[PDB]
Amino acid sequence: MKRRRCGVCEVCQQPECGKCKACKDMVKFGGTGRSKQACLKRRCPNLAVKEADDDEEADDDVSEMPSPKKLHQGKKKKQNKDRISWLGQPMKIEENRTYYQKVSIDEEMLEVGDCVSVIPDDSSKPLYLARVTALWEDKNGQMMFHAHWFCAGTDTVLGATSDPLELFLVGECENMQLSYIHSKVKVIYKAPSENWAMEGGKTYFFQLWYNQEYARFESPPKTQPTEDNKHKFCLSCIRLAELRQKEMPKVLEQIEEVDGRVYCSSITKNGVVYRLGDSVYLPPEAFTFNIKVASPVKRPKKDPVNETLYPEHYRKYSDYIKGSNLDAPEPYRIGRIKEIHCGKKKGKVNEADIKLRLYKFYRPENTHRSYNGSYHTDINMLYWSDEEAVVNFSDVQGRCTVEYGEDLLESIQDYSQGGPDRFYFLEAYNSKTKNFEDPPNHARSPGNKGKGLPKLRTLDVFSGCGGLSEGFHQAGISETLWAIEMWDPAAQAFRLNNPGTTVFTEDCNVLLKLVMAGEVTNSLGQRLPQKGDVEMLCGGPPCQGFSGMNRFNSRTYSKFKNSLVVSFLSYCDYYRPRFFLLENVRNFVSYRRSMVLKLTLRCLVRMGYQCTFGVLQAGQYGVAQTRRRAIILAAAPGEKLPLFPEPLHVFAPRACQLSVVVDDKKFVSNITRLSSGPFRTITVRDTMSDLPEIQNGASNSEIPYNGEPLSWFQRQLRGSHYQPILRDHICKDMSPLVAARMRHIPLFPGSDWRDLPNIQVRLGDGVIAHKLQYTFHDVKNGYSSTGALRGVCSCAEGKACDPESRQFSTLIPWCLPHTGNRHNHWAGLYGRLEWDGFFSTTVTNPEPMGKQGRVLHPEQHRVVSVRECARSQGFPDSYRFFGNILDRHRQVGNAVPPPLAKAIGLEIKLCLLS
DNA sequence: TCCCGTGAGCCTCCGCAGG
DNA sequence: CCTGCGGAGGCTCACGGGA
Numbered sequence: 001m002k003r004r005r006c007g008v009c010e011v012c013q014q015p016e017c018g019k020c021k022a023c024k025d026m027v028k029f030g031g032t033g034r035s036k037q038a039c040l041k042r043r044c045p046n047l048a049v050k051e052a053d054d055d056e057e058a059d060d061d062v063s064e065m066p067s068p069k070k071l072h073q074g075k076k077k078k079q080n081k082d083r084i085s086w087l088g089q090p091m092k093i094e095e096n097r098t099y100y101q102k103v104s105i106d107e108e109m110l111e112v113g114d115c116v117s118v119i120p121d122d123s124s125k126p127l128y129l130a131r132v133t134a135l136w137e138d139k140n141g142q143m144m145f146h147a148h149w150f151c152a153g154t155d156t157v158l159g160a161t162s163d164p165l166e167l168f169l170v171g172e173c174e175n176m177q178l179s180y181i182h183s184k185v186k187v188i189y190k191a192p193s194e195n196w197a198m199e200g201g202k203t204y205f206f207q208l209w210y211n212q213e214y215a216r217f218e219s220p221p222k223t224q225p226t227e228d229n230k231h232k233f234c235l236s237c238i239r240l241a242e243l244r245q246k247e248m249p250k251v252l253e254q255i256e257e258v259d260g261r262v263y264c265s266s267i268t269k270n271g272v273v274y275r276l277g278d279s280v281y282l283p284p285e286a287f288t289f290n291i292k293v294a295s296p297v298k299r300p301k302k303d304p305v306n307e308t309l310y311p312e313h314y315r316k317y318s319d320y321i322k323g324s325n326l327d328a329p330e331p332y333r334i335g336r337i338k339e340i341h342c343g344k345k346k347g348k349v350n351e352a353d354i355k356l357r358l359y360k361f362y363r364p365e366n367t368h369r370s371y372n373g374s375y376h377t378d379i380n381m382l383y384w385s386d387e388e389a390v391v392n393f394s395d396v397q398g399r400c401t402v403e404y405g406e407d408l409l410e411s412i413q414d415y416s417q418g419g420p421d422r423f424y425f426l427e428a429y430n431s432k433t434k435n436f437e438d439p440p441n442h443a444r445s446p447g448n449k450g451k452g453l454p455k456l457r458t459l460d461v462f463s464g465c466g467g468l469s470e471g472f473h474q475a476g477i478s479e480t481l482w483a484i485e486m487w488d489p490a491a492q493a494f495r496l497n498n499p500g501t502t503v504f505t506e507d508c509n510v511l512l513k514l515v516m517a518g519e520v521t522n523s524l525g526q527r528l529p530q531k532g533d534v535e536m537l538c539g540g541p542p543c544q545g546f547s548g549m550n551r552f553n554s555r556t557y558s559k560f561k562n563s564l565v566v567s568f569l570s571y572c573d574y575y576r577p578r579f580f581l582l583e584n585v586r587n588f589v590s591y592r593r594s595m596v597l598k599l600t601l602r603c604l605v606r607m608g609y610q611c612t613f614g615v616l617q618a619g620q621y622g623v624a625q626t627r628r629r630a631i632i633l634a635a636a637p638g639e640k641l642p643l644f645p646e647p648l649h650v651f652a653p654r655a656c657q658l659s660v661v662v663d664d665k666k667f668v669s670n671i672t673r674l675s676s677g678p679f680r681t682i683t684v685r686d687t688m689s690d691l692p693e694i695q696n697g698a699s700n701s702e703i704p705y706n707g708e709p710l711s712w713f714q715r716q717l718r719g720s721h722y723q724p725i726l727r728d729h730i731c732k733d734m735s736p737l738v739a740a741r742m743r744h745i746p747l748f749p750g751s752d753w754r755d756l757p758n759i760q761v762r763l764g765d766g767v768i769a770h771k772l773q774y775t776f777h778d779v780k781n782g783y784s785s786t787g788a789l790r791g792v793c794s795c796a797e798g799k800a801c802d803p804e805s806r807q808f809s810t811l812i813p814w815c816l817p818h819t820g821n822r823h824n825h826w827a828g829l830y831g832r833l834e835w836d837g838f839f840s841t842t843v844t845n846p847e848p849m850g851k852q853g854r855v856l857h858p859e860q861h862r863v864v865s866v867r868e869c870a871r872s873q874g875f876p877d878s879y880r881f882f883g884n885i886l887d888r889h890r891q892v893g894n895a896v897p898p899p900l901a902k903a904i905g906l907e908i909k910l911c912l913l914s
Numbered sequence: 915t916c917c918c919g920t921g922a923g924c925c926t927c928c929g930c931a932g933g
Numbered sequence: 934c935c936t937g938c939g940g941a942g943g944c945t946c947a948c949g950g951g952a
């Protein structure tokens with residue numbers, strides 16, 4: 001695969017001279033041009049594959065309504081039927097109605113189980129189609145039936161790409177006078193073959209069930225008739241029934257009655273069961289803290305920045321600071337349920353009025369110590385208080401576990417790592433004496449005195465260095481036996497981290513065409529994967545080939561049929577894994593007006609897979625980086641389609657638009673934690689504060705950790721086993737000019753190129769970087785506060801660009817103010833990360849002047865080291881990379897953050913323990 | 915009436931041949 | 934060294950609807 005040049009670096013930007021043997025031989029310079037080489041001074045050191053594409057926040061507010069019910073639009077054209085007679089004897093007689101099985105309508109016979117068409121109010125709409133689930137005459141002498149609605153492909157995400165003859169069962173059903181029926185249409189159920197896995201290479205039919213709100217296609221439910229519903233069995237009804245019984249609060253144990261308030265010991269809601277002494281997740285507003293908090297003082301008056309020293313500082317119009325947790329919500333409040341008591345209504349217990357007497361729990365950042373006092377603490381560690389509060393059981397977000405430190409029968413770390421939602425506390429807090437005594441005898445569970453599953457054979461395609469696999473492995477559901485990675489450094493790094501797996505360094509296409517042609521091994525004698533071998537197929541196909549937003553055309557769609565994603569599906573089609581995971585950039589879901597997404601789903605469903613899609617933000621799963629990825633899940637017919645993970649960390653609301661619009665329809669994932677979460681957001685401080693200080697160019701690929709972990713995050717990434725060596729703490733050697741610039745960016749949050757001094761600097765190069773000169777008037781931007789010009793080209797005056805107007809070796813890059821107006825003032829370029837913020841999407845090659853160019857260390861005068869990047873993703877420091885400093889950066893930036901891959905991994909685990 | 919996004923087609927120069 | 938060539942990725946400009 002052929003590499004190329006970056007557009008950003010100081011090398012590239014330098015224009016052509018005409019002094020070279022090549023510059024002299026160029027066609028434009030009159031040369032024959034047989035040379036075909038660039039300027040000698042324009043050989044970009046950063047030369048590497050820019051076979052990548054950043055993703056913009058293209059989605060709007062999505063301030064729009066959830067999808068209304070499909071067939072639930074009422075308005076159904078009633079027909080006129082002359083004669084409607086029952087047939088045979090009644091199946092069953094109830095108190096209020098009488099059920100039959102057969103009915104004849106205008107000489108036409110129908111039966112329960114038959115499928116009928118119906119006519120919609122609107123003429124445009126395609127006929128409704130449904131299954132008759134019961135027949136009966138009512139008290140009012142009316143002859144009725146119950147319809148279980150189908151749903152046409154075109155009504156789903158699939159849209160027009162659906163097979164016209166395909167319908168999908170849906171959770172919608174209503175009652176109707178038989179006379180609404182138009183015709184009876186035949187509908188076949190295309191169930192999966194006995195040998196489904198092995199088949200790689202004019203009637204209405206259905207195979208799957210469609211959840212509109214979540215865009216999930218799943219295998220028809222297995223629920224079975226009871227004694228009471230045999231004569232009238234409808235899946236849509238039961239589904240809804242079981243939903244409600246789960247959704248609504250009930251109660252399981254009552255202790256006593258008192259003062260018109262029954263006291264309870266055990267209540268349930270939404271599938272979770274709460275008992276006295278259990279702990280609970282609540283919203284931030286559920287209760288305040290009885291701790292005197294002094295409202296901070298209004299910031300001092302800042303002396304107007306010198307416009308002549310900081311010309312381009314005006315361009316910093318008040319703007320949302322990129323990588324700022326000033327928007328971060330607070331995490332769930334936590335408390336221990338002390339008492340439960342419900343009200344009463346109609347002489348009965350009123351389950352809609354359950355309240356909780358709770359012991360407030362302090363998060364370390366909740367004490368007076370504030371954040372500055374919780375930097376080094378376990379994110380799951382709590383401080384007990386005796387401060388109480390009463391809460392409505394309707395506000396409870398979930399159960400969690402909070403255990404006394406010492407009380408635990410294992411290691412604290414063992415405990416935390418043991419399962420989800422596990423907190424612990426060691427001391428207790430006194431909001432009054434602001435002291436830290438230890439837990440009262442009633443917080444503990446009275447005890448003895450003293451003080452302390454088969455794995456899926458996975459085939460990972462476009463594996464890269466194996467971020468994804470790493471996360472899966474962590475979840476313990478996979479054993480990667482084969483990996484395909486066309487790029488040789490990535491492939492090696494993968495081998496380095498997985499001695500058990502066979503990495504094929506080839507184009508997935510030929511590798512596939514090999515095993516299809518009945519080949520057993522590639523030219524290197526590596527055993528090829530055979531049907532039955534692969535249980536899970538995960539991959540990250542690049543879509544750079546056709547990453548377009550406009551509509552498909554003739555030969556643009558051809559570029560697709562030959563894409564890598566289509567190869568991925570040919571793998572899925574051939575191997576027929578139990579599971580299938582495609583991960584991509586967030587934009588995967590809207591490329592080509594979402595034909596990419598629609599077409600892949602269409603493919604999966606064609607094969608007969610259960611499948612869904614969603615967008616996830618990595619920050620929410622334990623990483624100090626903005627990273628939204630699209631995700632497709634698929635599951636063999638016999639399986640359970642997994643769900644999406646539930647956010648673990650609170651994260652900036654702007655970085656979290658997870659909803660997606662396809663054909664003006666709004667889809668979301670099962671994700672419930674919209675804003676808050678169990679844990680605090682991970683910061684740049686949390687990420688890389690323990691790292692030694694390094695200079696620009698630091699190439700030492702082995703240095704010691706001069707210090708211990710200073711973060712929960714770090715203790716997780718460095719493990720507990722003694723390891724004194726710090727690998728890959730190395731950053732790119734930036735031009736002396738660029739190094740000077742980085743030195744002159746302030747340290748405060750919000751710093752970037754716009755904060756640069758317009759001064760003259762003697763570099764450690766001998767060359768001198770000059771002042772930039774403003775010799776044109778900028779009609780849009782006006783004047784300095786002192787009437788100084790702000791334009792650097794004839795184009796700032798509306799006139800045509802003068803090429804001689806360009807300026808070189810200047811501290812403020814001439815090109816920036818030159819285009820800043822039409823590009824948002826390049827917010828972020830030469831920008832520094834901030835200790836309390838987060839990485840903008842980790843990049844494959846750190847350029848202060850690339851598009852995603854906020855990449856300077858918070859304090860040190862340099863770009864971020866390879867480790868700092870590996871750290872902004874989820875890589876354990878143990879994880880090994882391979883190649884020159886550039887190769888490594890690219891591998892890190894390309895990879896799925898293990899924390900995210902793990903989160904998904906665990907969701908899949910739940911489908912094997914089914 | 916324009917504006918935004920092209921994407922077919924010309925422009926560039928990377929990786930490697932072979933003298 | 935050098936000479937030079939394929940071929941693929943980039944950048945351009947005329948052209949199409951989306952409203």
Ligand SMILES: Nc1ncnc2c1ncn2[C@@H]1O[C@H](CSCC[C@H](N)C(=O)O)[C@@H](O)[C@H]1O
Pocket residue numbers: 461462463464465466467468469484485486487490506507508539540541542564894895896897
């Ligand atoms: N034609 C091809 N065949 C095999 N691999 C390819 C390929 N084209 C690109 N790739 C590789 O596919 C990878 C996609 S980035 C995905 C990385 C991976 N999911 C992780 O978590 O680490 C890149 O590393 C790229 O080198």
Ligand SMILES: [Zn+2]
Pocket residue numbers: 005006007008009010011012044045046047
């Ligand atoms: Zn460059």
Ligand SMILES: [Zn+2]
Pocket residue numbers: 016017018019020023038039040041
């Ligand atoms: Zn030159």
Ligand SMILES: [Zn+2]
Pocket residue numbers: 133146147148172173174234235236237238
């Ligand atoms: Zn029903």
Ligand SMILES: [Zn+2]
Pocket residue numbers: 793794795796800801802818
């Ligand atoms: Zn200009």
